[PDB]
Design an enzyme around this catalytic site. Structure first.
Site, PDB file in Angstrom:
ATOM      1  N   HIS A 113      -2.405  -7.731  -3.443  1.00  0.00           N
ATOM      2  CA  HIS A 113      -1.605  -6.784  -2.753  1.00  0.00           C
ATOM      3  C   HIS A 113      -0.342  -6.315  -3.649  1.00  0.00           C
ATOM      4  O   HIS A 113       0.372  -5.628  -3.226  1.00  0.00           O
ATOM      5  CB  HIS A 113      -1.145  -7.078  -1.318  1.00  0.00           C
ATOM      6  CG  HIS A 113      -0.173  -8.439  -1.135  1.00  0.00           C
ATOM      7  ND1 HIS A 113       0.983  -8.225  -1.278  1.00  0.00           N
ATOM      8  CD2 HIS A 113      -0.493  -9.823  -0.771  1.00  0.00           C
ATOM      9  CE1 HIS A 113       1.489  -9.701  -1.126  1.00  0.00           C
ATOM     10  NE2 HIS A 113       0.637 -10.473  -0.811  1.00  0.00           N
ATOM     11  N   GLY A 165       8.887 -12.596  -1.072  1.00  0.00           N
ATOM     12  CA  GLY A 165       8.848 -13.220  -2.702  1.00  0.00           C
ATOM     13  C   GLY A 165       8.040 -14.440  -2.856  1.00  0.00           C
ATOM     14  O   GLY A 165       7.996 -14.589  -4.215  1.00  0.00           O
ATOM     15  N   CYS A 211       5.014 -15.073  -2.226  1.00  0.00           N
ATOM     16  CA  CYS A 211       3.626 -14.688  -2.268  1.00  0.00           C
ATOM     17  C   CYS A 211       3.010 -15.131  -3.542  1.00  0.00           C
ATOM     18  O   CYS A 211       3.605 -14.581  -4.736  1.00  0.00           O
ATOM     19  CB  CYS A 211       3.241 -13.187  -2.079  1.00  0.00           C
ATOM     20  SG  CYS A 211       3.666 -12.643  -0.261  1.00  0.00           S
TER      21      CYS A 211
HETATM   22  O1  LIG Z   1       3.627 -11.038   4.527  1.00  0.00           O
HETATM   23  C1  LIG Z   1       4.237 -10.664   3.565  1.00  0.00           C
HETATM   24  N1  LIG Z   1       5.196 -11.499   3.049  1.00  0.00           N
HETATM   25  C2  LIG Z   1       5.687 -12.750   3.254  1.00  0.00           C
HETATM   26  C3  LIG Z   1       5.016 -13.786   3.357  1.00  0.00           C
HETATM   27  N2  LIG Z   1       5.699 -15.183   3.468  1.00  0.00           N
HETATM   28  C4  LIG Z   1       6.837 -14.948   4.107  1.00  0.00           C
HETATM   29  C5  LIG Z   1       7.542 -13.873   4.377  1.00  0.00           C
HETATM   30  C6  LIG Z   1       8.744 -13.767   5.063  1.00  0.00           C
HETATM   31  C7  LIG Z   1       9.579 -12.788   5.154  1.00  0.00           C
HETATM   32  C8  LIG Z   1       8.990 -11.626   4.861  1.00  0.00           C
HETATM   33  C9  LIG Z   1       7.884 -11.523   4.217  1.00  0.00           C
HETATM   34  C10 LIG Z   1       6.912 -12.497   3.905  1.00  0.00           C
HETATM   35  C11 LIG Z   1       4.067  -9.347   3.068  1.00  0.00           C
HETATM   36  C12 LIG Z   1       5.003  -8.280   3.493  1.00  0.00           C
HETATM   37  N3  LIG Z   1       4.932  -7.803   4.922  1.00  0.00           N
HETATM   38  S1  LIG Z   1       6.462  -7.609   5.837  1.00  0.00           S
HETATM   39  O2  LIG Z   1       6.421  -6.175   5.931  1.00  0.00           O
HETATM   40  O3  LIG Z   1       7.669  -8.318   5.378  1.00  0.00           O
HETATM   41  N4  LIG Z   1       6.292  -8.314   7.084  1.00  0.00           N
HETATM   42  C13 LIG Z   1       6.191  -9.569   7.231  1.00  0.00           C
HETATM   43  C14 LIG Z   1       7.293 -10.437   8.005  1.00  0.00           C
HETATM   44  C15 LIG Z   1       6.091 -10.558   8.565  1.00  0.00           C
HETATM   45  C16 LIG Z   1       3.761  -7.589   5.393  1.00  0.00           C
HETATM   46  C17 LIG Z   1       2.565  -7.904   4.481  1.00  0.00           C
HETATM   47  C18 LIG Z   1       1.314  -7.431   4.917  1.00  0.00           C
HETATM   48  C19 LIG Z   1      -0.001  -7.958   4.403  1.00  0.00           C
HETATM   49  C20 LIG Z   1       0.308  -8.757   3.220  1.00  0.00           C
HETATM   50 CL1  LIG Z   1      -1.162  -9.617   2.465  1.00  0.00          CL
HETATM   51  C21 LIG Z   1       1.494  -9.435   3.016  1.00  0.00           C
HETATM   52  C22 LIG Z   1       2.478  -8.913   3.617  1.00  0.00           C
END
Ligand SMILES: O=C(Nc1cncc2ccccc12)[C@@H]1CN(S(=O)(=O)NC2CC2)Cc2ccc(Cl)cc21
Ligand SMILES: O=C(Nc1cncc2ccccc12)[C@@H]1CN(S(=O)(=O)NC2CC2)Cc2ccc(Cl)cc21
Ligand SMILES: [Cl-]
Lengths: 298, 305
Positions: A41, A136, A138
């Protein structure tokens, strides 16, 4: 004496963490030999169509203060593999292993290719992990160490609406029914890892906490009928066999400890704690208990 | 999201761990530049521990009595000296893996990571705090002496603890890296016991602010308290007194969540009175005191949920 949530020493993994940037997205990569592994991603979906439009020079890889040159790229499931010009001189002895629910591992949380912390966690029965991750993070990885070899088992991909985390093994296969994209996804109803709670009860007995022991024993069937009512995972004969060594060290049969667990589920702790906890802890495996109460080094 | 007991990455410390042997005793040492630091009780037998005269035991030793092993390489000891309860062994090789470091003496309530080692080999890393009674609730077995506690804020390792002993209650006692013990402890096998411990109030408040940041407010109430009334109530539950320094230190978390320190103190008072009623706060059914205000700011998001 003492019992802590203990992680493996992270040094061998720290020397593999890099920063991967693709356009506006920045995340972490794992540099082993001449390949950097990271979540696909980073290019964001039709991943093949998005990837075909990228050249090697679109991927910026930074290892400490040095820019690595990407000389090739390929996708394997949900993981992007970036061939770089330089082999990591700090590459440890390693294997990629896929773990099962209930198994524990250490997580080296990273941001911008720089490790910030290490913590221990378990793969929940619902295939999520209760991690501590911000934007950040990931590409941060989970691992175990067995002798001098690092077994990489997890790469962080996303956070679900309940604040729990989802990711893949190092071959890019997700743990759980998750997909790498923005769509309605949710953690399933979770359960308690029974064999791990029993292991932690044996650790408490080894440490001098015996108030919960009783004269009773039970059958595996009766225990599972009771355990199913409290959202506990079924206990199998394999789990009973795995707890054999701890049973021999303390003199408490596994079904004897199951009778203690049954009473704790039906009556609570009554103002008491076990190893400084008022909840039944399920993120220590039988092997973690044996290792922490024996002193195994790496 | 999430909140874990998080330790610093241990790599910078792993590259400093060595094994020190003196006669029949084997324990861990910290190799920084050309000096190996270890507990002075490595020169003692078990009989010596009752009333050891370290100066008399040390004068009978030469450099070649100390065996130092770094990985598979034997380091040569070219000098030795004692500084308080630590032995400093001058070696003929500087550690090429020496990180940027400082020796810092911490105060009760401060947290740090521990790299537990046996035979100069690291086995695990965990986070802990210097208790108000100057002990640490560690996880250590025989052979762990010389294991160290540290923080790594930025690229510099601040060494704050070296493990020396386990007390009868299973808790641990040790020194700073200058050999000064934390607490009224001695590296002597005499009648020693941990004093009555107390809960680190400023840390529980910090952890309550972390729960608010992560999106949970069930424990808040419409009340406030004076600092004095809070302390009168807190001391009845074996909580450490909250000082104006602690109130000042909680300022940033108060501004991020919009909850005044004395209003969070009112919520803590009510939690002590009522318990949790089947509820948890950040996955715990007890009030957690091993996260400082600084640890909460380091781990939690800058945006409250
Ligand atoms: O989840 C992801 N990153 C994160 C990972 N870990 C902890 C985070 C804490 C805070 C913000 C991001 C975080 C990313 C980015 N976002 S997002 O729009 O930030 N929504 C997330 C809060 C629920 C959707 C998304 C969709 C698919 C995939 Cl594979 C990755 C991801
Ligand atoms: O405490 C020490 N070592 C340890 C240190 N840490 C965790 C241990 C766990 C298990 C066994 C040892 C452990 C040593 C050795 N012992 S001892 O006889 O083993 N008594 C302690 C168990 C109560 C007395 C002693 C007295 C003074 C000093 Cl400075 C050092 C020491
Ligand atoms: Cl301090």
């Amino acid at each position: 004496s003492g019992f802590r949530k203990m992680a493996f020493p992270s040094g061998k993994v720290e020397g593999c963490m890099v920063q991967v940037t693709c356009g506006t997205t920045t995340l972490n990569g794992l540099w082993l030999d001449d390949v950097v592994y990271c979540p696909r991603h980073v290019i964001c979906p039709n991943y093949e169509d998005l990837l075909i439009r990228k050249s090697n020079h679109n991927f910026l890889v930074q290892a400490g203060n040095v820019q690595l040159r990407v000389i090739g790229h390929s996708m394997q499931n949900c993981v992007l593999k970036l061939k770089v010009d330089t082999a990591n001189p700090k590459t440890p002895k390693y294997k990629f292993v896929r773990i099962q629910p209930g198994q524990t591992f250490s997580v080296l949380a990273c941001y911008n290719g720089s490790p910030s912390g290490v913590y221990q966690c378990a793969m929940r029965p619902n295939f999520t992990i209760k991690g501590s991750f911000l934007n950040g993070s990931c590409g941060s990885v989970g691992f175990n160490i067995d002798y001098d070899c690092v077994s990489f088992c997890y790469m962080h991909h996303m956070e679900l609406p309940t604040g729990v985390h989802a990711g893949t093994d190092l071959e890019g296969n997700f743990y759980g029914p998750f997909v790498d994209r923005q769509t309605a996804q949710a953690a399933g109803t979770d359960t308690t890892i029974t064999v791990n709670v029993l292991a932690w009860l044996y650790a408490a007995v080894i440490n001098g906490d015996r108030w919960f022991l009783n004269r009773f024993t039970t059958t595996l069937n009766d225990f599972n009928l009771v355990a199913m009512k409290y959202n506990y995972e079924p206990l199998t004969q394999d789990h009973v066999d795995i707890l054999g060594p701890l049973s021999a060290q303390t003199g408490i049969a596994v079904l004897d400890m199951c009778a203690s667990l049954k009473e704790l589920l039906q009556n609570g702790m009554n103002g008491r704690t076990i190893l400084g906890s008022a909840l039944l802890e399920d993120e220590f495996t039988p092997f973690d208990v044996v290792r922490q109460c024996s002193g195994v080094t790496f």
